Amino acid sequence: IANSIDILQEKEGHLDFVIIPHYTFLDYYKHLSYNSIYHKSSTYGKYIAVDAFIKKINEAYDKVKSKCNDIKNDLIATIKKLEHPFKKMMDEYNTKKKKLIKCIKNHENDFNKICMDMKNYGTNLFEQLSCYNNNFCNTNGIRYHYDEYIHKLILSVKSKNLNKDLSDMTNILQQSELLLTNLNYIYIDTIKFIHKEMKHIFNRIEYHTKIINDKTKIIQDKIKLNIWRTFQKDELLKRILDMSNEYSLFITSDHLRQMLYNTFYSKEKHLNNIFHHLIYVLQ
Amino acid sequence: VQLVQSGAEVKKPGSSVKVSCKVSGGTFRSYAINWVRQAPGQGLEWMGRIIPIFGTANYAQKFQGRVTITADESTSTAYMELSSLRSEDTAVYYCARHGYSSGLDIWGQGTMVTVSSASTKGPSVFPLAPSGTAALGCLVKDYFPEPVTVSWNSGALTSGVHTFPAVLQSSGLYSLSSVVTVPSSSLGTQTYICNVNHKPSNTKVDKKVEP
Amino acid sequence: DIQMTQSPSSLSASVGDRVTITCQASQDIRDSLNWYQHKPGKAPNLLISDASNLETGVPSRFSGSGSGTHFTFTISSLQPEDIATYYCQHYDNLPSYTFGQGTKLEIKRTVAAPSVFIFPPSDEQLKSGTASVVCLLNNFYPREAKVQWKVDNALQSGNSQESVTEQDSKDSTYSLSSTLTLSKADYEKHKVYACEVTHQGLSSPVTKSF
């Protein structure tokens, strides 16, 4: 559980942790709840209650995350100092990053209470799935949910070129690492730290990017098989649980990859600032 | 979301037609755009369906071979191609989205595709000057093909309006009348304009009927 | 593939009545029956989806019922705005969009007298050598009406006489438009023109002249 949290610093003076399994899990039951109310035409009105329930689930989950905020900002203020013109500052960062993660681990059951509250609500609606003939079930729920909740995201992802967005950052890290070698100085220390944090950010962007590319295709393939059909009630439920899984896996990796994209370029903005100082105002 | 089709058209017999249908969403998603035609008297007749996410079209036995349904995802428009037309094909062609209710949820406005060798002549608009209330109207004469859309006071006047169906003359051109009843009080106090619209000949008349 | 025998073809029921349209099937259709209200000019509107579900915004009077081979459509209270042709249909995922024959619901209401009005050819059209006269009968019932054109007493018959169809209204009333189109050469030749209207409401057949 300790190696499944991602840190995001989108703006210079920002920090946010994302518990990858928690976010995937809560998203899995968001799709399950929606599919459940949208299969039966009569249960469409439930959408208001489900919307306002998921609202308070995100609200209550974020109220737990905020308990670590005092530690979070203590770490932000250390990063803020570390990027500007070192042994004690590096250990100041380590002890605070490890302290913030421990804070999160202390609320393990406090987040899983919100998770279990969601799992129970989504399963409660899912068990209320009603078919006219349990042999010939309709795939209308899968279509309204895909059209109004998933297709938009797929087209948004297909619009951007994530393989290009990776090839951009390989060139950036190629030129920063190349300049670092030529630099033969306390500036070199802070530049080697930003370059190291970005190098191990590109890995997270590349990782999430593979998930997005493969889930995009695997969702577009499975959605052609689950719509305009008359499924057996058992196979219908199994295919809803199948879809909600691919949807949860895709959304989580897209949400994180876009946070990681802004995170890489916000810190790359400050890497080129130190270059403009170490050379222009120094030589 | 809304489906917008092309305006009416006269097509020469033996020719092909192409009725458009733009979706107001950006993409067709997992929608099924269906084409259903209404013949002169005959009831609704399903022709075909296209599921753009699938990439396959399905036609009725009657229309397999002549009809071809295409869909441009670049503009999110679905077209119906009725090739080698004959007089029988003169009908209103409709659009439909197979909605989440398992039925035709969104419908297009219709396209009056007429199959004739004659050409599009615009309408002539003459007034019907009034003689205990008082009626007045617009005479739309000698126009081909159907239809003509006549409104009163640019839409505002609706109560009392009787737009008559076009009767086809011995000449070969339609001729409708759009009467409306107003009181003898606002006869000289209120302004009355009929807004004729023959779309196949791009005509848009704004006649001022006076007593 | 699955024949949809929808009955009756026509229906002349009065206002504040109950109307029952029926749709049949050559095979078993579980719950795939869609009922539509096709208004003239207007595109067909979907009223009942999947045999019984009222479409969002369709009055409660309308109600789809039944399943299997026999399905029903019920309008609790006939309203003047419910005059239109009603169809049934089925979907089978094959695909199979078979359609119903069509029930034309026309209201049989109170006997009304026509509002006979005569319209002379406008001077704008007379300038172009044409002279089309118009006789208008407004808000009448029954839709059965006879209008004769007497050009200077003489009953001109074959000449024009294009009686335009009756637009059924949300007042449960009709309207006719007989038009005597002729050349201005024959129009200036005579001075008096009239339309002899005969109707079930008109006890004494009235005539409007000029």
Side-chain angles (χ1 to χ4, degrees), chain B residues 34 49 58 98 102-104 107 135 141 162-165 168 207, chain C residues 34 36 44 49-50 91 95 97 119 124 138-139 162 164 167 175 181:
Chain B
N34 300 8
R49 129 151 125 179
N58 315 106
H98 198 262
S102 279
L104 299 194
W107 279 76
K141 201 185 183 57
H162 289 106
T163 286
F164 282 97
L168 186 58
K207 169 115 284 145
Chain C
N34 308 127
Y36 302 87
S49 53
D50 280 351
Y91 169 58
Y97 297 85
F119 276 148
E124 177 191 352
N138 202 282
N139 288 351
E162 292 198 305
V164 180
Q167 166 200 297
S175 37
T181 71

PDB file of all heavy atoms in Angstrom, chain B residues 34 49 58 98 102-104 107 135 141 162-165 168 207, chain C residues 34 36 44 49-50 91 95 97 119 124 138-139 162 164 167 175 181:
ATOM      1  N   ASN B  34     -31.479   6.402 -37.708  1.00  0.00           N
ATOM      2  CA  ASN B  34     -32.371   5.659 -38.581  1.00  0.00           C
ATOM      3  C   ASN B  34     -33.044   6.560 -39.604  1.00  0.00           C
ATOM      4  O   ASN B  34     -33.275   7.742 -39.359  1.00  0.00           O
ATOM      5  CB  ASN B  34     -33.422   4.911 -37.772  1.00  0.00           C
ATOM      6  CG  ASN B  34     -32.845   3.924 -36.796  1.00  0.00           C
ATOM      7  OD1 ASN B  34     -31.645   3.847 -36.563  1.00  0.00           O
ATOM      8  ND2 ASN B  34     -33.690   3.134 -36.194  1.00  0.00           N
ATOM      9  N   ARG B  49     -30.780   1.840 -40.977  1.00  0.00           N
ATOM     10  CA  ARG B  49     -30.166   2.280 -39.733  1.00  0.00           C
ATOM     11  C   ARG B  49     -28.659   2.284 -39.894  1.00  0.00           C
ATOM     12  O   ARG B  49     -28.108   1.412 -40.566  1.00  0.00           O
ATOM     13  CB  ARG B  49     -30.592   1.368 -38.559  1.00  0.00           C
ATOM     14  CG  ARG B  49     -29.461   0.805 -37.701  1.00  0.00           C
ATOM     15  CD  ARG B  49     -29.901   0.569 -36.300  1.00  0.00           C
ATOM     16  NE  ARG B  49     -29.637  -0.814 -35.923  1.00  0.00           N
ATOM     17  CZ  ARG B  49     -29.897  -1.325 -34.727  1.00  0.00           C
ATOM     18  NH1 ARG B  49     -30.440  -0.570 -33.777  1.00  0.00           N
ATOM     19  NH2 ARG B  49     -29.608  -2.596 -34.465  1.00  0.00           N
ATOM     20  N   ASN B  58     -27.714  -1.189 -41.774  1.00  0.00           N
ATOM     21  CA  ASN B  58     -28.681  -2.261 -41.949  1.00  0.00           C
ATOM     22  C   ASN B  58     -29.885  -1.696 -42.692  1.00  0.00           C
ATOM     23  O   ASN B  58     -30.445  -0.703 -42.244  1.00  0.00           O
ATOM     24  CB  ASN B  58     -29.112  -2.783 -40.580  1.00  0.00           C
ATOM     25  CG  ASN B  58     -27.988  -3.008 -39.576  1.00  0.00           C
ATOM     26  OD1 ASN B  58     -27.803  -2.246 -38.608  1.00  0.00           O
ATOM     27  ND2 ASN B  58     -27.224  -4.064 -39.782  1.00  0.00           N
ATOM     28  N   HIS B  98     -32.102   6.108 -32.273  1.00  0.00           N
ATOM     29  CA  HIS B  98     -32.620   5.046 -31.411  1.00  0.00           C
ATOM     30  C   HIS B  98     -32.139   5.342 -29.985  1.00  0.00           C
ATOM     31  O   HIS B  98     -30.967   5.154 -29.652  1.00  0.00           O
ATOM     32  CB  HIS B  98     -32.187   3.656 -31.883  1.00  0.00           C
ATOM     33  CG  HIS B  98     -33.014   2.558 -31.303  1.00  0.00           C
ATOM     34  ND1 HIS B  98     -32.588   1.836 -30.207  1.00  0.00           N
ATOM     35  CD2 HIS B  98     -34.240   2.124 -31.663  1.00  0.00           C
ATOM     36  CE1 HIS B  98     -33.557   0.976 -29.949  1.00  0.00           C
ATOM     37  NE2 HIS B  98     -34.562   1.096 -30.814  1.00  0.00           N
ATOM     38  N   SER B 102     -35.140   2.449 -26.223  1.00  0.00           N
ATOM     39  CA  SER B 102     -35.369   1.413 -27.257  1.00  0.00           C
ATOM     40  C   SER B 102     -36.535   1.853 -28.145  1.00  0.00           C
ATOM     41  O   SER B 102     -37.521   1.097 -28.249  1.00  0.00           O
ATOM     42  CB  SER B 102     -35.597   0.074 -26.629  1.00  0.00           C
ATOM     43  OG  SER B 102     -34.359  -0.524 -26.275  1.00  0.00           O
ATOM     44  N   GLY B 103     -36.423   3.037 -28.753  1.00  0.00           N
ATOM     45  CA  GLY B 103     -37.448   3.574 -29.665  1.00  0.00           C
ATOM     46  C   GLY B 103     -36.845   4.795 -30.349  1.00  0.00           C
ATOM     47  O   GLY B 103     -35.683   5.103 -30.041  1.00  0.00           O
ATOM     48  N   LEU B 104     -37.578   5.470 -31.234  1.00  0.00           N
ATOM     49  CA  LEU B 104     -37.038   6.623 -32.002  1.00  0.00           C
ATOM     50  C   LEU B 104     -37.212   7.880 -31.148  1.00  0.00           C
ATOM     51  O   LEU B 104     -38.342   8.435 -31.130  1.00  0.00           O
ATOM     52  CB  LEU B 104     -37.726   6.691 -33.364  1.00  0.00           C
ATOM     53  CG  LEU B 104     -37.501   5.451 -34.229  1.00  0.00           C
ATOM     54  CD1 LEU B 104     -37.902   5.698 -35.673  1.00  0.00           C
ATOM     55  CD2 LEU B 104     -36.053   4.996 -34.149  1.00  0.00           C
ATOM     56  N   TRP B 107     -36.134  13.177 -33.607  1.00  0.00           N
ATOM     57  CA  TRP B 107     -36.546  13.086 -35.023  1.00  0.00           C
ATOM     58  C   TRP B 107     -36.115  14.329 -35.795  1.00  0.00           C
ATOM     59  O   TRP B 107     -36.142  15.421 -35.214  1.00  0.00           O
ATOM     60  CB  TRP B 107     -38.060  12.894 -35.112  1.00  0.00           C
ATOM     61  CG  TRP B 107     -38.540  11.493 -34.903  1.00  0.00           C
ATOM     62  CD1 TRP B 107     -38.639  10.820 -33.720  1.00  0.00           C
ATOM     63  CD2 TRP B 107     -39.030  10.599 -35.914  1.00  0.00           C
ATOM     64  NE1 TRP B 107     -39.143   9.566 -33.929  1.00  0.00           N
ATOM     65  CE2 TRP B 107     -39.393   9.402 -35.264  1.00  0.00           C
ATOM     66  CE3 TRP B 107     -39.190  10.691 -37.300  1.00  0.00           C
ATOM     67  CZ2 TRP B 107     -39.908   8.309 -35.958  1.00  0.00           C
ATOM     68  CZ3 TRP B 107     -39.695   9.608 -37.984  1.00  0.00           C
ATOM     69  CH2 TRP B 107     -40.047   8.435 -37.320  1.00  0.00           C
ATOM     70  N   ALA B 135     -61.690  38.124 -41.563  1.00  0.00           N
ATOM     71  CA  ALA B 135     -60.568  37.266 -41.928  1.00  0.00           C
ATOM     72  C   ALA B 135     -59.744  37.890 -43.048  1.00  0.00           C
ATOM     73  O   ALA B 135     -60.252  38.695 -43.834  1.00  0.00           O
ATOM     74  CB  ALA B 135     -61.068  35.895 -42.352  1.00  0.00           C
ATOM     75  N   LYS B 141     -49.292  31.174 -54.998  1.00  0.00           N
ATOM     76  CA  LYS B 141     -49.682  30.491 -56.215  1.00  0.00           C
ATOM     77  C   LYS B 141     -48.528  30.168 -57.148  1.00  0.00           C
ATOM     78  O   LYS B 141     -47.491  30.819 -57.095  1.00  0.00           O
ATOM     79  CB  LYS B 141     -50.727  31.353 -56.935  1.00  0.00           C
ATOM     80  CG  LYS B 141     -51.595  30.608 -57.929  1.00  0.00           C
ATOM     81  CD  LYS B 141     -52.507  31.562 -58.670  1.00  0.00           C
ATOM     82  CE  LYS B 141     -53.419  30.829 -59.614  1.00  0.00           C
ATOM     83  NZ  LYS B 141     -54.232  29.811 -58.901  1.00  0.00           N
ATOM     84  N   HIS B 162     -55.196  29.345 -40.252  1.00  0.00           N
ATOM     85  CA  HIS B 162     -55.524  28.124 -40.962  1.00  0.00           C
ATOM     86  C   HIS B 162     -54.680  28.094 -42.234  1.00  0.00           C
ATOM     87  O   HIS B 162     -55.071  28.703 -43.233  1.00  0.00           O
ATOM     88  CB  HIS B 162     -57.002  28.113 -41.370  1.00  0.00           C
ATOM     89  CG  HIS B 162     -57.965  27.938 -40.246  1.00  0.00           C
ATOM     90  ND1 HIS B 162     -58.732  28.994 -39.783  1.00  0.00           N
ATOM     91  CD2 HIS B 162     -58.301  26.820 -39.563  1.00  0.00           C
ATOM     92  CE1 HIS B 162     -59.492  28.491 -38.826  1.00  0.00           C
ATOM     93  NE2 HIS B 162     -59.273  27.184 -38.661  1.00  0.00           N
ATOM     94  N   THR B 163     -53.516  27.423 -42.200  1.00  0.00           N
ATOM     95  CA  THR B 163     -52.694  27.300 -43.400  1.00  0.00           C
ATOM     96  C   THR B 163     -53.205  26.064 -44.113  1.00  0.00           C
ATOM     97  O   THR B 163     -53.222  24.981 -43.535  1.00  0.00           O
ATOM     98  CB  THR B 163     -51.206  27.234 -43.071  1.00  0.00           C
ATOM     99  OG1 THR B 163     -50.764  28.533 -42.689  1.00  0.00           O
ATOM    100  CG2 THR B 163     -50.386  26.771 -44.248  1.00  0.00           C
ATOM    101  N   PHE B 164     -53.699  26.242 -45.336  1.00  0.00           N
ATOM    102  CA  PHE B 164     -54.297  25.180 -46.138  1.00  0.00           C
ATOM    103  C   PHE B 164     -53.276  24.326 -46.873  1.00  0.00           C
ATOM    104  O   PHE B 164     -52.251  24.843 -47.308  1.00  0.00           O
ATOM    105  CB  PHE B 164     -55.231  25.812 -47.168  1.00  0.00           C
ATOM    106  CG  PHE B 164     -56.561  26.254 -46.620  1.00  0.00           C
ATOM    107  CD1 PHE B 164     -56.775  27.567 -46.254  1.00  0.00           C
ATOM    108  CD2 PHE B 164     -57.602  25.359 -46.491  1.00  0.00           C
ATOM    109  CE1 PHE B 164     -58.002  27.972 -45.766  1.00  0.00           C
ATOM    110  CE2 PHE B 164     -58.826  25.768 -46.008  1.00  0.00           C
ATOM    111  CZ  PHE B 164     -59.021  27.070 -45.644  1.00  0.00           C
ATOM    112  N   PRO B 165     -53.559  23.029 -47.081  1.00  0.00           N
ATOM    113  CA  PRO B 165     -52.612  22.195 -47.835  1.00  0.00           C
ATOM    114  C   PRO B 165     -52.611  22.574 -49.308  1.00  0.00           C
ATOM    115  O   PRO B 165     -53.637  22.967 -49.854  1.00  0.00           O
ATOM    116  CB  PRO B 165     -53.137  20.780 -47.627  1.00  0.00           C
ATOM    117  CG  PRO B 165     -54.589  20.966 -47.390  1.00  0.00           C
ATOM    118  CD  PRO B 165     -54.729  22.254 -46.635  1.00  0.00           C
ATOM    119  N   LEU B 168     -52.482  20.600 -56.048  1.00  0.00           N
ATOM    120  CA  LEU B 168     -51.726  20.577 -57.296  1.00  0.00           C
ATOM    121  C   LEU B 168     -52.593  20.866 -58.511  1.00  0.00           C
ATOM    122  O   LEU B 168     -53.515  20.112 -58.816  1.00  0.00           O
ATOM    123  CB  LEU B 168     -50.960  19.259 -57.463  1.00  0.00           C
ATOM    124  CG  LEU B 168     -50.012  19.180 -58.660  1.00  0.00           C
ATOM    125  CD1 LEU B 168     -48.970  20.284 -58.624  1.00  0.00           C
ATOM    126  CD2 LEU B 168     -49.318  17.845 -58.704  1.00  0.00           C
ATOM    127  N   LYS B 207     -45.082  39.628 -47.590  1.00  0.00           N
ATOM    128  CA  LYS B 207     -46.234  40.389 -48.074  1.00  0.00           C
ATOM    129  C   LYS B 207     -46.997  41.145 -46.982  1.00  0.00           C
ATOM    130  O   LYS B 207     -47.311  40.580 -45.941  1.00  0.00           O
ATOM    131  CB  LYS B 207     -47.187  39.462 -48.867  1.00  0.00           C
ATOM    132  CG  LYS B 207     -48.568  40.050 -49.204  1.00  0.00           C
ATOM    133  CD  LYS B 207     -48.781  40.231 -50.698  1.00  0.00           C
ATOM    134  CE  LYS B 207     -48.048  41.421 -51.247  1.00  0.00           C
ATOM    135  NZ  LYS B 207     -47.556  41.161 -52.620  1.00  0.00           N
TER     136      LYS B 207
ATOM    137  N   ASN C  34     -43.158   0.475 -29.454  1.00  0.00           N
ATOM    138  CA  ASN C  34     -43.083   1.922 -29.322  1.00  0.00           C
ATOM    139  C   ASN C  34     -44.291   2.567 -30.008  1.00  0.00           C
ATOM    140  O   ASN C  34     -44.599   2.210 -31.141  1.00  0.00           O
ATOM    141  CB  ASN C  34     -41.749   2.438 -29.873  1.00  0.00           C
ATOM    142  CG  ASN C  34     -40.526   1.736 -29.310  1.00  0.00           C
ATOM    143  OD1 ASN C  34     -39.659   1.236 -30.040  1.00  0.00           O
ATOM    144  ND2 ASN C  34     -40.433   1.669 -27.988  1.00  0.00           N
ATOM    145  N   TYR C  36     -46.246   6.068 -31.372  1.00  0.00           N
ATOM    146  CA  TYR C  36     -45.941   7.434 -31.797  1.00  0.00           C
ATOM    147  C   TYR C  36     -47.184   8.215 -32.173  1.00  0.00           C
ATOM    148  O   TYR C  36     -48.175   7.623 -32.593  1.00  0.00           O
ATOM    149  CB  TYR C  36     -45.014   7.423 -33.022  1.00  0.00           C
ATOM    150  CG  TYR C  36     -43.697   6.713 -32.824  1.00  0.00           C
ATOM    151  CD1 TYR C  36     -43.587   5.349 -33.031  1.00  0.00           C
ATOM    152  CD2 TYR C  36     -42.540   7.421 -32.536  1.00  0.00           C
ATOM    153  CE1 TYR C  36     -42.378   4.694 -32.874  1.00  0.00           C
ATOM    154  CE2 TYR C  36     -41.322   6.777 -32.382  1.00  0.00           C
ATOM    155  CZ  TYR C  36     -41.245   5.409 -32.547  1.00  0.00           C
ATOM    156  OH  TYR C  36     -40.056   4.738 -32.395  1.00  0.00           O
ATOM    157  N   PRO C  44     -42.971  12.658 -36.464  1.00  0.00           N
ATOM    158  CA  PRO C  44     -43.581  11.828 -35.410  1.00  0.00           C
ATOM    159  C   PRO C  44     -42.923  11.968 -34.040  1.00  0.00           C
ATOM    160  O   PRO C  44     -41.700  11.958 -33.912  1.00  0.00           O
ATOM    161  CB  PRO C  44     -43.440  10.400 -35.947  1.00  0.00           C
ATOM    162  CG  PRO C  44     -43.213  10.545 -37.398  1.00  0.00           C
ATOM    163  CD  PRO C  44     -42.479  11.837 -37.581  1.00  0.00           C
ATOM    164  N   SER C  49     -42.631   4.262 -24.835  1.00  0.00           N
ATOM    165  CA  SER C  49     -41.431   3.507 -25.148  1.00  0.00           C
ATOM    166  C   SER C  49     -41.418   2.229 -24.352  1.00  0.00           C
ATOM    167  O   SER C  49     -41.720   2.242 -23.160  1.00  0.00           O
ATOM    168  CB  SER C  49     -40.199   4.319 -24.795  1.00  0.00           C
ATOM    169  OG  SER C  49     -40.258   4.766 -23.451  1.00  0.00           O
ATOM    170  N   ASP C  50     -41.060   1.130 -25.008  1.00  0.00           N
ATOM    171  CA  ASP C  50     -40.998  -0.190 -24.402  1.00  0.00           C
ATOM    172  C   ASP C  50     -42.324  -0.593 -23.733  1.00  0.00           C
ATOM    173  O   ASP C  50     -42.368  -0.849 -22.533  1.00  0.00           O
ATOM    174  CB  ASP C  50     -39.788  -0.341 -23.458  1.00  0.00           C
ATOM    175  CG  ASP C  50     -38.462  -0.629 -24.168  1.00  0.00           C
ATOM    176  OD1 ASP C  50     -38.486  -0.896 -25.398  1.00  0.00           O
ATOM    177  OD2 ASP C  50     -37.402  -0.576 -23.498  1.00  0.00           O
ATOM    178  N   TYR C  91     -38.813  -3.213 -32.247  1.00  0.00           N
ATOM    179  CA  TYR C  91     -37.372  -3.284 -32.520  1.00  0.00           C
ATOM    180  C   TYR C  91     -36.873  -4.672 -32.067  1.00  0.00           C
ATOM    181  O   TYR C  91     -37.354  -5.180 -31.053  1.00  0.00           O
ATOM    182  CB  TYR C  91     -36.616  -2.125 -31.853  1.00  0.00           C
ATOM    183  CG  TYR C  91     -35.109  -2.268 -31.878  1.00  0.00           C
ATOM    184  CD1 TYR C  91     -34.422  -2.395 -33.075  1.00  0.00           C
ATOM    185  CD2 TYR C  91     -34.373  -2.267 -30.706  1.00  0.00           C
ATOM    186  CE1 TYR C  91     -33.038  -2.514 -33.103  1.00  0.00           C
ATOM    187  CE2 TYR C  91     -32.991  -2.386 -30.719  1.00  0.00           C
ATOM    188  CZ  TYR C  91     -32.325  -2.506 -31.919  1.00  0.00           C
ATOM    189  OH  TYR C  91     -30.957  -2.656 -31.912  1.00  0.00           O
ATOM    190  N   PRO C  95     -31.178  -5.868 -37.090  1.00  0.00           N
ATOM    191  CA  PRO C  95     -32.318  -5.072 -36.586  1.00  0.00           C
ATOM    192  C   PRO C  95     -33.667  -5.379 -37.229  1.00  0.00           C
ATOM    193  O   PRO C  95     -33.716  -6.013 -38.272  1.00  0.00           O
ATOM    194  CB  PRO C  95     -31.899  -3.649 -36.930  1.00  0.00           C
ATOM    195  CG  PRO C  95     -31.244  -3.828 -38.252  1.00  0.00           C
ATOM    196  CD  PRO C  95     -30.424  -5.093 -38.095  1.00  0.00           C
ATOM    197  N   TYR C  97     -37.160  -2.993 -37.452  1.00  0.00           N
ATOM    198  CA  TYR C  97     -38.051  -1.901 -37.102  1.00  0.00           C
ATOM    199  C   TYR C  97     -39.344  -2.021 -37.897  1.00  0.00           C
ATOM    200  O   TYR C  97     -39.589  -1.225 -38.800  1.00  0.00           O
ATOM    201  CB  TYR C  97     -37.392  -0.528 -37.327  1.00  0.00           C
ATOM    202  CG  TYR C  97     -36.171  -0.240 -36.482  1.00  0.00           C
ATOM    203  CD1 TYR C  97     -34.913  -0.668 -36.877  1.00  0.00           C
ATOM    204  CD2 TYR C  97     -36.263   0.523 -35.328  1.00  0.00           C
ATOM    205  CE1 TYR C  97     -33.780  -0.369 -36.134  1.00  0.00           C
ATOM    206  CE2 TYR C  97     -35.141   0.811 -34.562  1.00  0.00           C
ATOM    207  CZ  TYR C  97     -33.892   0.396 -34.990  1.00  0.00           C
ATOM    208  OH  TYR C  97     -32.764   0.673 -34.253  1.00  0.00           O
ATOM    209  N   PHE C 119     -63.401  36.130 -51.382  1.00  0.00           N
ATOM    210  CA  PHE C 119     -62.194  36.914 -51.625  1.00  0.00           C
ATOM    211  C   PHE C 119     -61.947  37.172 -53.102  1.00  0.00           C
ATOM    212  O   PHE C 119     -61.723  36.244 -53.874  1.00  0.00           O
ATOM    213  CB  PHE C 119     -60.965  36.274 -50.974  1.00  0.00           C
ATOM    214  CG  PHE C 119     -60.800  36.630 -49.516  1.00  0.00           C
ATOM    215  CD1 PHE C 119     -60.243  35.734 -48.629  1.00  0.00           C
ATOM    216  CD2 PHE C 119     -61.163  37.880 -49.045  1.00  0.00           C
ATOM    217  CE1 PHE C 119     -60.083  36.068 -47.292  1.00  0.00           C
ATOM    218  CE2 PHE C 119     -61.023  38.201 -47.704  1.00  0.00           C
ATOM    219  CZ  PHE C 119     -60.473  37.298 -46.840  1.00  0.00           C
ATOM    220  N   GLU C 124     -52.938  43.360 -57.748  1.00  0.00           N
ATOM    221  CA  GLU C 124     -51.543  43.021 -57.994  1.00  0.00           C
ATOM    222  C   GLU C 124     -51.478  41.815 -58.938  1.00  0.00           C
ATOM    223  O   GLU C 124     -50.680  41.813 -59.872  1.00  0.00           O
ATOM    224  CB  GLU C 124     -50.854  42.712 -56.658  1.00  0.00           C
ATOM    225  CG  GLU C 124     -49.404  42.280 -56.773  1.00  0.00           C
ATOM    226  CD  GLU C 124     -48.803  41.714 -55.497  1.00  0.00           C
ATOM    227  OE1 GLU C 124     -49.464  41.792 -54.436  1.00  0.00           O
ATOM    228  OE2 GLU C 124     -47.666  41.191 -55.558  1.00  0.00           O
ATOM    229  N   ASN C 138     -65.000  28.781 -42.865  1.00  0.00           N
ATOM    230  CA  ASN C 138     -64.184  28.624 -41.667  1.00  0.00           C
ATOM    231  C   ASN C 138     -64.891  27.935 -40.502  1.00  0.00           C
ATOM    232  O   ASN C 138     -66.096  28.107 -40.325  1.00  0.00           O
ATOM    233  CB  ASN C 138     -63.634  29.986 -41.245  1.00  0.00           C
ATOM    234  CG  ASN C 138     -62.406  29.918 -40.384  1.00  0.00           C
ATOM    235  OD1 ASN C 138     -62.479  29.658 -39.185  1.00  0.00           O
ATOM    236  ND2 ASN C 138     -61.249  30.170 -40.973  1.00  0.00           N
ATOM    237  N   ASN C 139     -64.122  27.163 -39.705  1.00  0.00           N
ATOM    238  CA  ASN C 139     -64.545  26.453 -38.494  1.00  0.00           C
ATOM    239  C   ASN C 139     -65.941  25.796 -38.578  1.00  0.00           C
ATOM    240  O   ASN C 139     -66.826  26.107 -37.778  1.00  0.00           O
ATOM    241  CB  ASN C 139     -64.438  27.372 -37.273  1.00  0.00           C
ATOM    242  CG  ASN C 139     -63.014  27.651 -36.849  1.00  0.00           C
ATOM    243  OD1 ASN C 139     -62.058  27.045 -37.347  1.00  0.00           O
ATOM    244  ND2 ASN C 139     -62.840  28.588 -35.927  1.00  0.00           N
ATOM    245  N   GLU C 162     -60.657  24.147 -57.226  1.00  0.00           N
ATOM    246  CA  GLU C 162     -59.728  23.370 -56.407  1.00  0.00           C
ATOM    247  C   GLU C 162     -60.020  23.573 -54.929  1.00  0.00           C
ATOM    248  O   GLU C 162     -59.390  24.414 -54.288  1.00  0.00           O
ATOM    249  CB  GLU C 162     -58.275  23.719 -56.717  1.00  0.00           C
ATOM    250  CG  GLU C 162     -57.843  23.275 -58.096  1.00  0.00           C
ATOM    251  CD  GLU C 162     -56.340  23.229 -58.248  1.00  0.00           C
ATOM    252  OE1 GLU C 162     -55.685  24.265 -57.995  1.00  0.00           O
ATOM    253  OE2 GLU C 162     -55.814  22.146 -58.583  1.00  0.00           O
ATOM    254  N   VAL C 164     -59.539  23.185 -51.402  1.00  0.00           N
ATOM    255  CA  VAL C 164     -58.423  22.786 -50.559  1.00  0.00           C
ATOM    256  C   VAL C 164     -58.914  21.999 -49.346  1.00  0.00           C
ATOM    257  O   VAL C 164     -59.967  22.317 -48.806  1.00  0.00           O
ATOM    258  CB  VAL C 164     -57.589  24.011 -50.132  1.00  0.00           C
ATOM    259  CG1 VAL C 164     -56.445  23.577 -49.253  1.00  0.00           C
ATOM    260  CG2 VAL C 164     -57.060  24.777 -51.342  1.00  0.00           C
ATOM    261  N   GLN C 167     -58.112  21.589 -42.699  1.00  0.00           N
ATOM    262  CA  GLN C 167     -57.159  21.460 -41.602  1.00  0.00           C
ATOM    263  C   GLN C 167     -57.944  21.251 -40.306  1.00  0.00           C
ATOM    264  O   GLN C 167     -58.684  22.145 -39.900  1.00  0.00           O
ATOM    265  CB  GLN C 167     -56.279  22.720 -41.515  1.00  0.00           C
ATOM    266  CG  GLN C 167     -55.461  22.858 -40.218  1.00  0.00           C
ATOM    267  CD  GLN C 167     -55.030  24.283 -39.993  1.00  0.00           C
ATOM    268  OE1 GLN C 167     -54.280  24.845 -40.791  1.00  0.00           O
ATOM    269  NE2 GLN C 167     -55.492  24.904 -38.907  1.00  0.00           N
ATOM    270  N   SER C 175     -62.069  23.726 -42.198  1.00  0.00           N
ATOM    271  CA  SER C 175     -61.966  24.933 -43.029  1.00  0.00           C
ATOM    272  C   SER C 175     -61.730  24.547 -44.502  1.00  0.00           C
ATOM    273  O   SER C 175     -60.912  23.675 -44.766  1.00  0.00           O
ATOM    274  CB  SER C 175     -60.883  25.888 -42.524  1.00  0.00           C
ATOM    275  OG  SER C 175     -59.746  25.209 -42.017  1.00  0.00           O
ATOM    276  N   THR C 181     -59.933  29.847 -60.364  1.00  0.00           N
ATOM    277  CA  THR C 181     -58.859  30.512 -61.088  1.00  0.00           C
ATOM    278  C   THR C 181     -59.266  30.658 -62.554  1.00  0.00           C
ATOM    279  O   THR C 181     -59.732  29.688 -63.154  1.00  0.00           O
ATOM    280  CB  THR C 181     -57.547  29.720 -60.929  1.00  0.00           C
ATOM    281  OG1 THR C 181     -57.636  28.508 -61.674  1.00  0.00           O
ATOM    282  CG2 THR C 181     -57.235  29.385 -59.479  1.00  0.00           C
TER     283      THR C 181
END
